[PDB]
DNA sequence: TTGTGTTATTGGCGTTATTAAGGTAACTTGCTTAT
């Protein structure tokens, strides 16, 4: 469903989208938040457990 | 004023440098481009 959103009229597939989602937000040289974000984002939240 | 000397051009010629056309048979098979 997501696929479709990404690219309307865009018959999908079985092995292409388990690469663009995961490749939307999980690709270290495609998204990252550059030792701030990470803090930025732990301290709003307090989780330490979460690798900075 | 009429004779003998240029000339300026102007279609023909060839010459060739430049452009266009075509052909190889080891196997090859679906981006998305990013305030």
Known sequence: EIY???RPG??????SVK??????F???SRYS???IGRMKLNA????DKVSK
């Open 4 to 6: 479709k959103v990404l």
């Open 10 to 15: 865009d018959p999908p597939a079985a092995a």
């Open 19 to 24: 690469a663009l989602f995961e490749g939307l």
């Open 26 to 28: 999980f690709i270290e």
């Open 33 to 35: 938040l550059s030792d």
């Open 44 to 47: 709003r939240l307090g989780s």
